[PDB]
Design an enzyme around this catalytic site. Structure first.
Site, PDB file in Angstrom:
ATOM      1  N   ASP A 128     104.391  27.261  69.859  1.00  0.00           N
ATOM      2  CA  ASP A 128     103.186  26.499  69.556  1.00  0.00           C
ATOM      3  C   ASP A 128     102.969  25.483  70.680  1.00  0.00           C
ATOM      4  O   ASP A 128     103.606  24.429  70.703  1.00  0.00           O
ATOM      5  CB  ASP A 128     103.330  25.809  68.194  1.00  0.00           C
ATOM      6  N   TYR A 152      76.960  36.023  60.629  1.00  0.00           N
ATOM      7  CA  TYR A 152      78.171  36.601  60.052  1.00  0.00           C
ATOM      8  C   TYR A 152      78.686  37.715  60.961  1.00  0.00           C
ATOM      9  O   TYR A 152      77.977  38.686  61.230  1.00  0.00           O
ATOM     10  CB  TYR A 152      77.918  37.130  58.631  1.00  0.00           C
ATOM     11  N   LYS A 195      93.036  19.743  72.136  1.00  0.00           N
ATOM     12  CA  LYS A 195      93.914  18.699  72.664  1.00  0.00           C
ATOM     13  C   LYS A 195      93.826  18.607  74.191  1.00  0.00           C
ATOM     14  O   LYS A 195      92.763  18.278  74.722  1.00  0.00           O
ATOM     15  CB  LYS A 195      95.357  18.930  72.206  1.00  0.00           C
ATOM     16  N   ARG A 211      87.221  21.934  68.421  1.00  0.00           N
ATOM     17  CA  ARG A 211      88.286  21.972  67.435  1.00  0.00           C
ATOM     18  C   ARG A 211      88.421  23.387  66.873  1.00  0.00           C
ATOM     19  O   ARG A 211      87.459  23.952  66.348  1.00  0.00           O
ATOM     20  CB  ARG A 211      88.013  20.954  66.325  1.00  0.00           C
ATOM     21  N   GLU A 237      82.163  39.253  60.835  1.00  0.00           N
ATOM     22  CA  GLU A 237      83.465  39.796  60.452  1.00  0.00           C
ATOM     23  C   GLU A 237      83.858  40.990  61.315  1.00  0.00           C
ATOM     24  O   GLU A 237      83.029  41.845  61.624  1.00  0.00           O
ATOM     25  CB  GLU A 237      83.469  40.201  58.979  1.00  0.00           C
ATOM     26  N   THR A 255      95.969  24.922  69.788  1.00  0.00           N
ATOM     27  CA  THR A 255      94.671  24.369  69.451  1.00  0.00           C
ATOM     28  C   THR A 255      93.821  24.366  70.709  1.00  0.00           C
ATOM     29  O   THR A 255      94.351  24.427  71.820  1.00  0.00           O
ATOM     30  CB  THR A 255      94.788  22.946  68.883  1.00  0.00           C
TER      31      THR A 255
HETATM   32  C1  LIG Z   1      82.056  35.217  47.317  1.00  0.00           C
HETATM   33  C2  LIG Z   1      82.667  34.952  48.663  1.00  0.00           C
HETATM   34  N1  LIG Z   1      83.783  34.146  48.772  1.00  0.00           N
HETATM   35  C3  LIG Z   1      84.353  33.897  50.008  1.00  0.00           C
HETATM   36  C4  LIG Z   1      83.798  34.452  51.156  1.00  0.00           C
HETATM   37  C5  LIG Z   1      84.416  34.206  52.519  1.00  0.00           C
HETATM   38  O1  LIG Z   1      83.960  33.020  53.127  1.00  0.00           O
HETATM   39  P1  LIG Z   1      84.232  32.814  54.701  1.00  0.00           P
HETATM   40  O2  LIG Z   1      83.682  31.466  55.108  1.00  0.00           O
HETATM   41  O3  LIG Z   1      83.526  33.909  55.468  1.00  0.00           O
HETATM   42  O4  LIG Z   1      85.719  32.858  54.955  1.00  0.00           O
HETATM   43  C6  LIG Z   1      82.678  35.265  51.051  1.00  0.00           C
HETATM   44  C7  LIG Z   1      82.049  35.824  52.291  1.00  0.00           C
HETATM   45  N2  LIG Z   1      81.237  36.828  52.216  1.00  0.00           N
HETATM   46  C8  LIG Z   1      80.670  37.760  53.183  1.00  0.00           C
HETATM   47  C9  LIG Z   1      81.714  38.799  53.593  1.00  0.00           C
HETATM   48  O5  LIG Z   1      82.318  39.389  52.459  1.00  0.00           O
HETATM   49  C10 LIG Z   1      79.431  38.448  52.621  1.00  0.00           C
HETATM   50  O6  LIG Z   1      78.634  39.043  53.348  1.00  0.00           O
HETATM   51  O7  LIG Z   1      79.195  38.417  51.416  1.00  0.00           O
HETATM   52  C11 LIG Z   1      82.109  35.515  49.806  1.00  0.00           C
HETATM   53  O8  LIG Z   1      81.003  36.313  49.711  1.00  0.00           O
END
Ligand SMILES: Cc1ncc(COP(=O)(O)O)c(CN[C@@H](CO)C(=O)O)c1O
Lengths: 414, 415
Positions: free
Chosen positions: B202, B57, B231, B237, B59, B228
């Site tokens: 695009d 993860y 292509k 992808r 972010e 993208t």
């Molecule tokens: C409950 C919940 N719903 C959606 C997402 C996001 O999913 P993604 O595939 O990352 O877009 C999360 C993601 N959670 C992370 C960051 O908040 C976590 O550590 O909990 C989520 O918990």
């Protein structure tokens, strides 16, 4: 284009070197981030397949491109297995992520400006549940509900808010909430004001599949999830929905908000679902729940507090105030001791949001690499050791050495 | 054990999925693929997104993550950013978009509010779904004004200018999914500036050609350039946003926390590998062959009595008008498919047929060029196509062509 010459090491040494370091990092650290796991070599092999080469807009048996007979087999297996896992009436396995799964429901059922209800971020709700810097909160009117005095979900207050604001859709689910959620009660609340119920079970999905956490599917119109958390699959999303919402959901994902699906990742989803259907997976999640409880119990013995007073899941929010340390400082110190956690605000946090008074901990990853109750208890004690002297070099080193013993003894990938 | 790389193979864990992938592997070998948006990516690229980076993860952005332990995925992402900036001369870049659609949605979320007016190339004339289709987010949640081709089947820049002045779009979209000629990005930039609109190009289809310098670069002229990676760029992808430095913060904020969460770091690693490959002299040589093979294919079909929309191609792609052989796009796709030639149907300007039927097929050279086809093979393929089109239901004709396709595919294996 013989797999011998086109290796990462030969083609891109810098990226190869970085990937190698990440492999070792995953081995050498104890991972307690509640949203992370270690997926299987089979799952990784699947999304490393040639299925990345295929454009397959549309759905099985109804594609825009020719030559999709075999990717259709793959996607339909993914659909059937995930329906079987959760007892869902219908499913969409094309969402690129948890966020896109959630956006798909929103695009299907709502118009910009509509009112929605979700769990507040301050009390453990997710970004996509109405944050003003997220699409969910910027393009929609958001009303949030939170916890009560016992730090359980305040269902009465939520009911009051629902009646007052008349949301078109109610979101349930959380990123940092340890207890069982009462989906049946939220369903009644939603019905009483004519709102849709969407449950985001991303964090609990693996537990739900194994029957050790309650299933929202019989109660909700829509259930969204990630495939990479407790479900232990590849990175991506899924939408589960009642049959009556099959057409709007499918149209919303394509051509609504996505284009060509990631067929290699969907193949990887299918493999993960196959694994999740096994008796071994049920046993895994029983251990996940067990290890989380033991971890929580151990921290309490060492004088920490668990938000909501207990865990009934994979996750816990630890109140750090008894040890006079901030979440930010705790995360940093634990990280130095090779224990990975993340800071997290607690209810009525006296600290600023970037500082916080808590850390979120989860058991899925450490359970996957083989930790049992004895190890979970040991990890609890190591955490407390760091928290009680976060800047003492000798303390950090002693813990790091013990962490090293655990990680060597319990390798992730053999 | 479930996490032993010896025991955890697809065949061992999931025989059914193993079988389907194996059949797909062989299908990719046994068919000549002329879908203009498809390619064959390298084993190195595939190996990268089959890595353990799927477990992380991450972010946020390099050096500004919300989670700890991102030191190595930071190296990966920054390499991807730096290389793609180098490929296209971009001032800034975001390599996290999950797809081309999410790349386009990222720009929209950054710069627009629901209900705003935008301009894009019409779908009927080769524009993409995400350029204002009413069943797409771009067209359902925004007010769309579309511009198309002129009588010569080139882009009607005069009409576009008039529409811009009349409707005052907040943003103008350029780029296409089915347009063979060079697009005048500089002229579109001028039109956009003249009404105070943003210009978003695009370049998904043309990106690989642009990187190699055989198709004009929109980056010096546009506020935003989306693409993208799978292509003509021949990568994994996913999507990318290129933007001027002044739009760096809104774009990054739009991708996260705006419309995505955790980035696919394994795929971003694959993007980085693909960008490294694209920077090589071999890649430029590849795209020169792509352009050559497309020209030869077009010329060959014209010799066999077909017509090319716009009268020529200056790229990887062509739209073939099938009316002279009295066959629909739908029927052509089906017949060619039986002969193991993969194409997709596509409407032509002023198409007399229903949208699900069409009078045309879209053809592209990136894939066949990748597996080694040269001008001689491109010409042979053109003639084989014509053979099928002139007798699409003759069993013996389908069989003879299939036999020749098999000879070519055996001679030019992909993997
Ligand atoms: C409950 C919940 N719903 C959606 C997402 C996001 O999913 P993604 O595939 O990352 O877009 C999360 C993601 N959670 C992370 C960051 O908040 C976590 O550590 O909990 C989520 O918990």
């Amino acid at each position: 284009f013989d797999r011998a010459q086109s290796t990462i090491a030969n083609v891109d040494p810098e990226i190869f070197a970085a990937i190698e370091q990440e492999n070792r990092r995953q081995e050498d650290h104890i991972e307690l981030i509640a949203s992370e796991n270690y997926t299987s070599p089979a799952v990784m092999a699947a999304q490393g397949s040639q299925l990345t080469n295929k454009y397959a807009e549309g759905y099985p048996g109804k594609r825009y491109y020719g030559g999709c007979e075999y990717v259709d087999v793959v996607e339909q297996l993914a659909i059937d297995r995930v329906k079987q896992l959760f007892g869902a009436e219908a499913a969409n396995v094309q969402p690129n992520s948890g966020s896109q799964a959630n956006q798909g429901v929103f695009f299907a059922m709502l118009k910009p400006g509509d009112t929605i209800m979700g769990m507040s971020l301050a009390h453990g709700g997710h970004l996509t549940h109405g944050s003003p810097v997220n699409m969910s909160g910027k393009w929609f009117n958001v009303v949030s509900y939170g916890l009560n005095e016992n730090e359980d979900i305040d269902y009465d207050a939520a009911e009051k808010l629902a009646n007052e604001h008349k949301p078109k859709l109610i979101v349930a689910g959380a990123s940092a909430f340890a207890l069982k959620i009462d989906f049946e009660r939220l369903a009644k609340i939603a019905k009483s004001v004519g709102a849709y119920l969407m449950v985001d079970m991303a964090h609990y999905a693996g537990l739900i599949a194994a029957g050790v956490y309650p299933n929202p599917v019989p109660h909700a119109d829509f259930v969204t999830t990630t495939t990479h958390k407790s479900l232990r699959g590849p990175r991506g999303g899924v939408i589960l929905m009642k049959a009556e919402y099959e057409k709007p959901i499918n149209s919303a994902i394509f051509p609504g908000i996505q284009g060509g699906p990631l067929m290699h990742v969907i193949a990887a989803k299918a493999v993960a679902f196959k694994e999740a259907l096994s008796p071994e997976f049920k046993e895994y999640q029983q251990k996940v729940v067990e290890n989380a409880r033991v971890l929580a119990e151990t921290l309490v013995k060492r004088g920490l507090r668990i938000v909501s007073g207990r865990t009934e899941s994979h996750v816990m929010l630890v109140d750090l105030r008894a040890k006079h340390i901030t979440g930010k400082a705790a995360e940093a110190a634990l990280g130095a001791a090779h224990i990975t956690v993340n800071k997290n605000a607690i209810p009525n946090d006296p600290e600023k949001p970037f500082v916080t008074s808590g850390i979120r901990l989860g058991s899925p990853a450490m359970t996957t690499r083989g930790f049992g109750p004895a190890e979970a208890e040991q990890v609890g004690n190591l955490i407390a050791d760091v928290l009680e002297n976060p800047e003492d070099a000798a303390t950090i080193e002693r813990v790091r050495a013990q962490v090293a013993e655990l990680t060597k003894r319990f390798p992730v990938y053999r």
